[PDB]
Amino acid sequence: ASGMIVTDAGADQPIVFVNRAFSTITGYAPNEVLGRNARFLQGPQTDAATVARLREAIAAARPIQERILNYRKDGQPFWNQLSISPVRDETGNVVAFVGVRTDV
Amino acid sequence: ASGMIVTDAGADQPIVFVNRAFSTITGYAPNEVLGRNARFLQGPQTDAATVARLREAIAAARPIQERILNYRKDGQPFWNQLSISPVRDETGNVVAFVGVRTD
Numbered sequence: 550a551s552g553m554i555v556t557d558a559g560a561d562q563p564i565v566f567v568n569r570a571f572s573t574i575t576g577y578a579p580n581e582v583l584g585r586n587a588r589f590l591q592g593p594q595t596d597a598a599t600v601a602r603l604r605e606a607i608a609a610a611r612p613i614q615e616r617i618l619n620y621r622k623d624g625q626p627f628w629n630q631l632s633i634s635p636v637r638d639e640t641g642n643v644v645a646f647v648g649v650r651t652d653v
Numbered sequence: 654a655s656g657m658i659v660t661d662a663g664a665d666q667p668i669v670f671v672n673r674a675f676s677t678i679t680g681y682a683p684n685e686v687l688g689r690n691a692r693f694l695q696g697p698q699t700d701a702a703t704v705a706r707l708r709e710a711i712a713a714a715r716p717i718q719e720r721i722l723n724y725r726k727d728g729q730p731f732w733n734q735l736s737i738s739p740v741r742d743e744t745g746n747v748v749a750f751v752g753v754r755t756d
């Protein structure tokens with residue numbers, strides 16, 4: 550099972566849903582992460598240039614895939630093969646973003 | 654005000670999340686719809702041919718758009734300009750489905 554995060558489209562993309570796999574991988578329960586930007590998964594050794602490419606792609610609602618260093622609730626690092634894509638309505642308005650961690 | 658439904662990929666695609674717009678449009682609260690297939694939104698006047706095209710698309714994990722007749726919680730019918738797509742991991746495995754109603 551691949552981890553999945555769903556966020557609102559605007560206002561710094563607060564998380565609105567995480568799947569069971571996300572909780573298994575990261576050690577966070579939904580109530581711990583709902584309403585927060587997913588950046589809390591990053592840590593001291595996360596690559597700033599990768600984070601910058603994510604920031605630019607999401608701002609422009611452009612799909613992006615990056616291998617990024619993240620951290621579990623307990624502080625242990627894990628590699629995240631991360632794919633983020635906008636969810637659009639038929640007018641092209643962005644309704645949400647979906648992030649998937651591919652394991653592999 | 655675009656409604657959104659997210660479901661599991663397998664085993665009759667039970668709803669795992671609906672956005673605020675969904676509850677506004679349909680009159681259903683999240684806890685009323687979670688764990689259920691979205692087909693409860695359908696009713697007597699719903700076009701069976703439209704439902705069959707959705708069934709075949711979802712079964713094959715093909716993106717599809719249909720104008721389908723749906724029913725609010727209070728039994729009032731509304732037109733759902735519905736767009737469904739699979740969410741895939743980078744292996745191509747289907748992780749979930751997302752349905753959007755365009756207003």
Ligand SMILES: Cc1cc2nc3c(=O)[nH]c(=O)nc-3n(C[C@H](O)[C@H](O)[C@H](O)COP(=O)(O)O)c2cc1C
Pocket residue numbers: 554555556562586587588590591600601603604607617618619629631633646647648649
């Ligand atoms: C739907 C979605 C899922 C995301 N998932 C992750 C993730 O799993 N790990 C991660 O480090 N960042 C993730 N992000 C990225 C952060 O939320 C943020 O966009 C990124 O750190 C770049 O912006 P910043 O420079 O403001 O932090 C995700 C973003 C979105 C929109």
Ligand SMILES: Cc1cc2nc3c(=O)[nH]c(=O)nc-3n(C[C@H](O)[C@H](O)[C@H](O)COP(=O)(O)O)c2cc1C
Pocket residue numbers: 658659660666690691692694695704705707708711721723733735737750751752753
């Ligand atoms: C993510 C997702 C969202 C859906 N949203 C709707 C909806 O808003 N209205 C609707 O009538 N059917 C919706 N469906 C379709 C039904 O769940 C079901 O697939 C459809 O009725 C055809 O299958 P059946 O013939 O087994 O009912 C959705 C399906 C998925 C996977």
Ligand code: NA
Pocket residue numbers: 614630631632649650651742743
């Ligand atoms: Na991925």
